[PDB]
Amino acid sequence: VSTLIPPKVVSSKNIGSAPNAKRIANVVHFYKSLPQGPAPAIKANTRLARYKAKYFDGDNASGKPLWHFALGIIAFGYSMEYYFH
Amino acid sequence: AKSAANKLDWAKVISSLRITGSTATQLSSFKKRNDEARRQLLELQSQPTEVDFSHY
């Protein structure tokens, strides 16, 4: 009797394995990926984006904006001492 | 001969291992092999069609 037709019916091996699910994710995801990002934000020259550029970089954990920002509040109230005295 | 068909068949049987879709497909190939093996031994068994009018 003639061989049956199972080997040639493939359309439930298109969901049949788990990486089909992953495939339909990364055919979208990686295809819509850019070569490099859009932009990281670091500066924009609003003149305080420069503050971010010098101090608040991705790799700058350096305490300098803190010191500067602290010193700003010291400059503020010290003048206000002379506003009240 | 018949062996050409069957050489491709058994090469395909051990390939059919590499498809799990088979259920009774391998049984259909096995059946064609059975009766194919029957006809060759039938054909080899064969008597001369008619009795010898010379000797017999």
Swiss-Prot record, chain A:
Complex formation: F-type ATPases have 2 components, CF(1) - the catalytic core - and CF(0) - the membrane proton channel. In yeast, the dimeric form of ATP synthase consists of 17 polypeptides: alpha, beta, gamma, delta, epsilon, 4 (B), 5 (OSCP), 6 (A), 8, 9 (C), d, E (Tim11), f, g, h, i/j and k.
Keywords associated with the record: ATP synthesis, CF(0), Hydrogen ion transport, Ion transport, Membrane, Mitochondrion, Mitochondrion inner membrane, Transit peptide, Transport
Protein task: Mitochondrial membrane ATP synthase (F(1)F(0) ATP synthase or Complex V) produces ATP from ADP in the presence of a proton gradient across the membrane which is generated by electron transport complexes of the respiratory chain. F-type ATPases consist of two structural domains, F(1) - containing the extramembraneous catalytic core and F(0) - containing the membrane proton channel, linked together by a central stalk and a peripheral stalk. During catalysis, ATP synthesis in the catalytic domain of F(1) is coupled via a rotary mechanism of the central stalk subunits to proton translocation.
Gene name for this UniProt entry: ATP17
Additional detail: Present with 14600 molecules/cell in log phase SD medium.
Superkingdom of origin organism: Eukaryota
Keyword Transport: yes
GO cellular component terms, semicolon-separated: mitochondrial inner membrane; mitochondrion; proton-transporting ATP synthase complex
First and last residues shown, out of full length: 7 to 91 of 101
Native species: Saccharomyces cerevisiae (strain ATCC 204508 / S288c)
Record has Transferase as a keyword: no
Record's protein name: ATP synthase subunit f, mitochondrial
Localization, UniProt: Mitochondrion; Mitochondrion inner membrane
GO terms of biological process kind: proton motive force-driven ATP synthesis; proton transmembrane transport
Family: Belongs to the ATPase F chain family.
From Swiss-Prot, chain B:
Family that this chain belongs to: Belongs to the ATPase d subunit family.
Stated name of the protein: ATP synthase subunit d, mitochondrial
Note: Present with 6820 molecules/cell in log phase SD medium.
Function according to Swiss-Prot or TrEMBL: Mitochondrial membrane ATP synthase (F(1)F(0) ATP synthase or Complex V) produces ATP from ADP in the presence of a proton gradient across the membrane which is generated by electron transport complexes of the respiratory chain. F-type ATPases consist of two structural domains, F(1) - containing the extramembraneous catalytic core, and F(0) - containing the membrane proton channel, linked together by a central stalk and a peripheral stalk. During catalysis, ATP synthesis in the catalytic domain of F(1) is coupled via a rotary mechanism of the central stalk subunits to proton translocation.
Oligomer and partners: F-type ATPases have 2 components, CF(1) - the catalytic core - and CF(0) - the membrane proton channel. In yeast, the dimeric form of ATP synthase consists of 17 polypeptides: alpha, beta, gamma, delta, epsilon, 4 (B), 5 (OSCP), 6 (A), 8, 9 (C), d, E (Tim11), f, g, h, i/j and k.
Subcellular compartments: Mitochondrion; Mitochondrion inner membrane
